[PDB]
Amino acid sequence: TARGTPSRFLASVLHNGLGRYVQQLQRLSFSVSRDGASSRGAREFVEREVIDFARRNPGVVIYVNSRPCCVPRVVAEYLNGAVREESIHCKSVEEISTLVQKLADQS
Amino acid sequence: LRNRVTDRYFRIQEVLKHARHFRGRKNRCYRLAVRTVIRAFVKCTKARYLKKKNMRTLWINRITAASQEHGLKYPALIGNLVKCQVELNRKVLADLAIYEPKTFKSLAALASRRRHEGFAAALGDGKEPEGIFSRVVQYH
Amino acid sequence: KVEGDIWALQKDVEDFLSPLLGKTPVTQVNEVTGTLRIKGYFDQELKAWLLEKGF
Amino acid sequence: IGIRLTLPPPKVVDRWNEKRAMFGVYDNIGILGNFEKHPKELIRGPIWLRGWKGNELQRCIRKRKMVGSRMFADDLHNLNKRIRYLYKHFNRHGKFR
Amino acid sequence: KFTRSRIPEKVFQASPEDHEKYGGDPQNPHKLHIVTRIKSTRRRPYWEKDIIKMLGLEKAHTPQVHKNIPSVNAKLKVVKHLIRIKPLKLPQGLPAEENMSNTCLKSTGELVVQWHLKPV
Amino acid sequence: NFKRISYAKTKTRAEVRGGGRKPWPQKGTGRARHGSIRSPLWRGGGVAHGPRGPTSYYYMLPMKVRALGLKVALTVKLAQDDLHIMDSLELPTGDPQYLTELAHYRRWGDSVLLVDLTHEEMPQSIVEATSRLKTFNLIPAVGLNVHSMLKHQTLVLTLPTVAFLEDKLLWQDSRYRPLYPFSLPYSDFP
Amino acid sequence: LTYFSARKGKRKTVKAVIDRFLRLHCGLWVRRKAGYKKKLWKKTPARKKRLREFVFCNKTQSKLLDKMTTSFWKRRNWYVDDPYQKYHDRTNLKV
Amino acid sequence: RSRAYTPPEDLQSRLESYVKEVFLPSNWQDISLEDSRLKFNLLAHLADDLGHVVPNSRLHQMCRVRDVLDFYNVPIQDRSKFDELSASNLPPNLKITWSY
Amino acid sequence: ARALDLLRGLPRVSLANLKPNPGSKKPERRPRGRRRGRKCGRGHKGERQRGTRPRLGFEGGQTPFYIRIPKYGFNEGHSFRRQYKPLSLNRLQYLIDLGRVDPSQPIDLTQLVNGRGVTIQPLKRDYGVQLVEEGADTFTAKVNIEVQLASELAIAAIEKNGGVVTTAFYDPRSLDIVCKPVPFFLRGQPIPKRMLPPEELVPYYTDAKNRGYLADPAKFPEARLELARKYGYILPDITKDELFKMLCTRKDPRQIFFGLAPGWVVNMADKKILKPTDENLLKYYTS
RNA sequence: GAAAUUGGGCGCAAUAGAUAUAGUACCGCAAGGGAAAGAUGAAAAAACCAAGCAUAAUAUAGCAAGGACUAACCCCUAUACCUUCUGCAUAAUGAAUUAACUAGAAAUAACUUUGCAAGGAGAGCCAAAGCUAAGACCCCCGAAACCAGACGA
Numbered sequence A: 001t002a003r004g005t006p007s008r009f010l011a012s013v014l015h016n017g018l019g020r021y022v023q024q025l026q027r028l029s030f031s032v033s034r035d036g037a038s039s040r041g042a043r044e045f046v047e048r049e050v051i052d053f054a055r056r057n058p059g060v061v062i063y064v065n066s067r068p069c070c071v072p073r074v075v076a077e078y079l080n081g082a083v084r085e086e087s088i089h090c091k092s093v094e095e096i097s098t099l100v101q102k103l104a105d106q107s
Numbered sequence B: 001l002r003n004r005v006t007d008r009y010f011r012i013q014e015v016l017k018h019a020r021h022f023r024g025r026k027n028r029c030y031r032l033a034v035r036t037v038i039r040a041f042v043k044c045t046k047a048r049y050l051k052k053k054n055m056r057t058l059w060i061n062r063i064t065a066a067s068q069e070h071g072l073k074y075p076a077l078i079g080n081l082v083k084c085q086v087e088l089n090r091k092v093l094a095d096l097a098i099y100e101p102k103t104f105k106s107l108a109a110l111a112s113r114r115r116h117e118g119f120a121a122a123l124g125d126g127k128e129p130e131g132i133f134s135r136v137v138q139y140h
Numbered sequence C: 001k002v003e004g005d006i007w008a009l010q011k012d013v014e015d016f017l018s019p020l021l022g023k024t025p026v027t028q029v030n031e032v033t034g035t036l037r038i039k040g041y042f043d044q045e046l047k048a049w050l051l052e053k054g055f
Numbered sequence D: 001i002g003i004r005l006t007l008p009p010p011k012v013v014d015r016w017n018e019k020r021a022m023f024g025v026y027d028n029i030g031i032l033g034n035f036e037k038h039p040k041e042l043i044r045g046p047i048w049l050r051g052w053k054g055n056e057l058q059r060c061i062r063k064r065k066m067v068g069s070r071m072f073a074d075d076l077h078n079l080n081k082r083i084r085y086l087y088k089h090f091n092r093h094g095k096f097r
Numbered sequence E: 001k002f003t004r005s006r007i008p009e010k011v012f013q014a015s016p017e018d019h020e021k022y023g024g025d026p027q028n029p030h031k032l033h034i035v036t037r038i039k040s041t042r043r044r045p046y047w048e049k050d051i052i053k054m055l056g057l058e059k060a061h062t063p064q065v066h067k068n069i070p071s072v073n074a075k076l077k078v079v080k081h082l083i084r085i086k087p088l089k090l091p092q093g094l095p096a097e098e099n100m101s102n103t104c105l106k107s108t109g110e111l112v113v114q115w116h117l118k119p120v
Numbered sequence F: 001n002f003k004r005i006s007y008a009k010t011k012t013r014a015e016v017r018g019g020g021r022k023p024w025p026q027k028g029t030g031r032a033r034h035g036s037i038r039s040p041l042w043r044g045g046g047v048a049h050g051p052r053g054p055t056s057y058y059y060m061l062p063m064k065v066r067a068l069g070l071k072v073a074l075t076v077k078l079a080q081d082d083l084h085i086m087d088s089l090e091l092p093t094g095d096p097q098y099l100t101e102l103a104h105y106r107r108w109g110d111s112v113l114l115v116d117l118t119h120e121e122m123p124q125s126i127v128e129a130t131s132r133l134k135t136f137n138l139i140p141a142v143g144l145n146v147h148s149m150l151k152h153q154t155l156v157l158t159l160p161t162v163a164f165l166e167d168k169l170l171w172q173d174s175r176y177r178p179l180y181p182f183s184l185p186y187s188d189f190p
Numbered sequence G: 001l002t003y004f005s006a007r008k009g010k011r012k013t014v015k016a017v018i019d020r021f022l023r024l025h026c027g028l029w030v031r032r033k034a035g036y037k038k039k040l041w042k043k044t045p046a047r048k049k050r051l052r053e054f055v056f057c058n059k060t061q062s063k064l065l066d067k068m069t070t071s072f073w074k075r076r077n078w079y080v081d082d083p084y085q086k087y088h089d090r091t092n093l094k095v
Numbered sequence H: 001r002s003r004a005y006t007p008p009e010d011l012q013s014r015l016e017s018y019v020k021e022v023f024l025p026s027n028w029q030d031i032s033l034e035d036s037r038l039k040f041n042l043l044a045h046l047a048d049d050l051g052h053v054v055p056n057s058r059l060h061q062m063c064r065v066r067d068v069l070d071f072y073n074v075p076i077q078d079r080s081k082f083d084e085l086s087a088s089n090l091p092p093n094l095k096i097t098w099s100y
Numbered sequence I: 001a002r003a004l005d006l007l008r009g010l011p012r013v014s015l016a017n018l019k020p021n022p023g024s025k026k027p028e029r030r031p032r033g034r035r036r037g038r039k040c041g042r043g044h045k046g047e048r049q050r051g052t053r054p055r056l057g058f059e060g061g062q063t064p065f066y067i068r069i070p071k072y073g074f075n076e077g078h079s080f081r082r083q084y085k086p087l088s089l090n091r092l093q094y095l096i097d098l099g100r101v102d103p104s105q106p107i108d109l110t111q112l113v114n115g116r117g118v119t120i121q122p123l124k125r126d127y128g129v130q131l132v133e134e135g136a137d138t139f140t141a142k143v144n145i146e147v148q149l150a151s152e153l154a155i156a157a158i159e160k161n162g163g164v165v166t167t168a169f170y171d172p173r174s175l176d177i178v179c180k181p182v183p184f185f186l187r188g189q190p191i192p193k194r195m196l197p198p199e200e201l202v203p204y205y206t207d208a209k210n211r212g213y214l215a216d217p218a219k220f221p222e223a224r225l226e227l228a229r230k231y232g233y234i235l236p237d238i239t240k241d242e243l244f245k246m247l248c249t250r251k252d253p254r255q256i257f258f259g260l261a262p263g264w265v266v267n268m269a270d271k272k273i274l275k276p277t278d279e280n281l282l283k284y285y286t287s
Numbered sequence J: 001g002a003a004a005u006u007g008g009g010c011g012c013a014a015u016a017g018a019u020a021u022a023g024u025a026c027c028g029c030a031a032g033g034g035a036a037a038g039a040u041g042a043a044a045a046a047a048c049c050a051a052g053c054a055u056a057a058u059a060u061a062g063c064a065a066g067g068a069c070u071a072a073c074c075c076c077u078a079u080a081c082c083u084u085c086u087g088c089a090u091a092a093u094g095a096a097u098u099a100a101c102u103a104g105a106a107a108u109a110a111c112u113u114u115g116c117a118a119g120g121a122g123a124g125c126c127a128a129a130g131c132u133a134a135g136a137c138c139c140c141c142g143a144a145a146c147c148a149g150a151c152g153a
């Protein structure tokens, strides 16, 4: 509901549109298991799409960690110190491209 | 018990996290919290229609008040802004009524001007030259 | 017992029983098991046709 | 609070145990051992259900008629009552008929 | 018993006062009806609900073109309290395949086959 | 699942000890109606739909589906590049370290299913080498199956085991419906 | 009926059904009409001709009798001079 | 031992020389390998020279010498995925670590 | 197969890659949730929610359908009636033309069952094979069949081509030895003697028209002349051609197998035959 | 309802598993009934989380919320849940609350997916495309009673 959840006013970070537009997403942090069906579509995302994504916006620095994880995560860190950790557990490559592009588009 | 439930704390905490601001034992006990949390969600969805309704009647109250400041009433103002093809809606006219009252005064003079052109128009029946603000813009 | 490219046999039966019905008969290749499932009784006709094809 | 505060001790499993590594060997002892044995002779268990599958009423009727002579007395009595209940349940109660 | 209702033919014979009131012509009548369901078929009998399904009037306030023929008009005489009937008038001609997409039916009843969005 | 027998059995409410009379009268006390202290609602009562007895999950597939499952396993292990065919399972030494280093040199896999023709005629060298190992296994050709072919990463046959498998699995295709079991004497089967 | 017996654990037939009805192998049950031998002095000969007829059963009657018999009674029977042997196979349906 | 293979720049003429060391006619690329001695000597000499053996799944796939020549001039390369990603010309904002 | 070529690149098939054929395993439906259980499928609290609907066929109190109807002897003596599995001549032409039944040897019932062209079961009271006139035209086979019943047109269709058909009788015991003889020789019993027909089948198997195995062998050319004149074929004499010694041999009654005798004990293991020499046993088995 | 005839754990782990730490304590004249529970560490010769309270009582007004709001309330909207009914806010039933336990078991026939196919099946059984295999449908508590054998004046 809305009375149990906090609320806020619609703002931007440092007047994000006025002078120039600044990409608000600093770091992505993929942690992808080498052997494991949970991070399969993550692996196919690293083999295919994370390089073209990394070139389509160079203001984002990307850390693929490749450790023996049991649930893969992506950790979006934003310019204002906000850290949104979302799971890419058992998600296909297209769904991780829409998820990572969703984290890139927002603030 | 061969397989009995281990993950049950988290189902109770799925329901009870929405109850953390209730009174009584509704914030604490699961049997009471399920009924009040279900009921709070049903009110939460049925109140979207009431949000739209109450915003619109609130705008009609604000347009009514600020049009009573200029001598008009609400139905003369809205009907005669429709009849000028100035198709501003209620939200915008309430926001002009609050923040930009010269524009709302000029919309009130445009609407009352068109109202008097309707009075003088329906007064002198038969063929007469039309009003100046009474003309319509034909689209094709 | 179809071993090979089942779609070519589906195309040849699709071009064989369509004069015997008018409409093209609805089939179902099961490319795993290697079968092909035509709707309607065409047993003696397909046994004669597959004996003409030399199998 | 019916949940445990500490994580349990870890479950080590040896996948190359003697039982796990040679599991399933001589299941095809009929189809490539010249059919001298049937694989239902390869299973070990109760003597009334080596090579046989039934529901509960059938398992208890077969249990009584095969090994019921040398069963213990209140096991024989409990088993007669179970056959009598499961008779009255399967043959008289139920939705589909 | 509330039954189905028949309507005599003198009800559907127009008068010159009606021919002057509504802009119709008895000689050379119109070809196509615009029909619009404007009254819910709930709290109505099942035959009327069926006719409203047969005419494609399941959504309210959506126009539907029918023929001005006595069979279609028989179905429209069944549900005449649930609909609105207007003639489809065509100022310009019926649209060719060149003007097929750039049409718009106006609220007056006319199908304008050259539909810009520009003022005169 | 066919060898599986589940020894789980719980007590029903007639087998659990005691509890023969009503605990309190039917209408006097304002407590609930109960008939025994051993009904499935009580702490200590019987189980309603628990597991009942040793239950055997026995079922045979047709033997053509088992033999076709062995065939299918052999084409899968061959086409995955996991089939290896020897001429004989004779090692130079009876040491396990030679066999593991050989299997790491040829990059077979972490687990090897060595298969010879019988159990009596296996050479002593492969017996002393594989009898100390967890992941390398000797089966005779009689004990070939599908679970242990999928369990092991490579499968290693010899040529007489291959001729044995062609004999046995190519027999199931082009053979009649039986009249009586194949253990009985026929005209040409043994 | 008995869905599971106490000795073998099989289905049992209702022997009344066997003693009154005739399973044809197509699935049709053949019966005799009720009252075909009672009070014939007061029946018209058209009605006497109607009562002396072998009569097929309904769909639901046929399912009811199939459930009350076991698989022995649903079986091909190659008798010598059976009078109903030509009625077992169902010729020339179009569903 | 490495599974990495590079086709030689003179693989054609070597392979024709091994066909001549086994045999010889015109259209030497169209010689049928139905004889098993022929196939074992030819693919044994190619497996011995080139350090790269035809696998069991592909061994019945060559029935002419043309298919042998088609198999031996694909670069089969084996390297770890740490060495396949991080040497794939990464942009300067991909940093890839490996806890292996 | 290009699917093996797909299997090269795909990973190894293990016990973690298996997956049933989609469509085989329907999901288990079990009464938890909003939909599968509140009343859990049974309805409202009547007598079918409680679980105690009456037996199958009880119509609520009126006399049921299966009892309002008079008993008639449809199935009165069903397990004493004789059954006879059909052998059409299209079927036996199919068996002879595919090597499954050898026409250069006499066609016993052992030879039909070992050819697996006719499956008969001695339990469920099949008394053997009956000949069937289906496919009597387009039957081109010179043959020596022994079939327990035979129609006139099947005897005509076989004897046209130079065939011999006689009708034998078998007990259920004897026919149980004729069907599957090899589980009889592993039983250890001596070979019994097949009995005579009972009183109703005796006038069947002594008539030469339907070719009894107990009939006059002086009336057979009259009966073959009768079927030759009835169906229009010049009756060939079997005495001329060169399978005649094969086409003449019948095992006599009280002999189950062709070359064996009653009282003999076949030892399948060391491949021998034990034959009695006691005189009382010979007065028993040669009776 | 025959016969001839034939031939160690995909267990439980302290409300579970035995009633059992014990047929003890206790109840009953007796026959009989029948419990509950323990958790340190190698050596004692060494936190966080159920209800319930407390920290910290209360502020006009109303199924205890929801829309919101600068703002907890004030504004507006809103006839607890289950069950049984034609219809329950119903002043009909049940429920103090927390934890743990506590209720859909299977047949022939049909259907889906394989295998083989005029045959199927590892005998027996079915077969006028069938047969074999698998998957998938059938609850819980409650009488007053009746009978048998004991225990009781």
Ligand SMILES: [Mg+2]
Pocket: F013, F014, F018, F019, F020
């Ligand atoms: Mg009891």
Ligand SMILES: [Mg+2]
Pocket: F030
């Ligand atoms: Mg009370």
Ligand SMILES: [Mg+2]
Pocket: F011, F016, F044, F045, F046
């Ligand atoms: Mg217990």
Ligand SMILES: [Mg+2]
Pocket: I052
């Ligand atoms: Mg009852």
Ligand SMILES: [Mg+2]
Pocket: I061
């Ligand atoms: Mg009555």
Ligand SMILES: [Mg+2]
Pocket: none
């Ligand atoms: Mg017996």
Ligand SMILES: [Mg+2]
Pocket: none
């Ligand atoms: Mg206990």
Ligand SMILES: [Mg+2]
Pocket: F044, J019
């Ligand atoms: Mg206890």
Ligand SMILES: [Mg+2]
Pocket: none
């Ligand atoms: Mg607390």
Ligand SMILES: [Mg+2]
Pocket: none
């Ligand atoms: Mg209020």
Ligand SMILES: [Mg+2]
Pocket: none
């Ligand atoms: Mg009400």
Ligand SMILES: [Mg+2]
Pocket: J084
């Ligand atoms: Mg009630």
Ligand SMILES: [Mg+2]
Pocket: none
């Ligand atoms: Mg009250």
Ligand SMILES: [Mg+2]
Pocket: none
């Ligand atoms: Mg109440």
Ligand SMILES: [Mg+2]
Pocket: none
């Ligand atoms: Mg109460």
Ligand SMILES: [Mg+2]
Pocket: J153
């Ligand atoms: Mg006294």
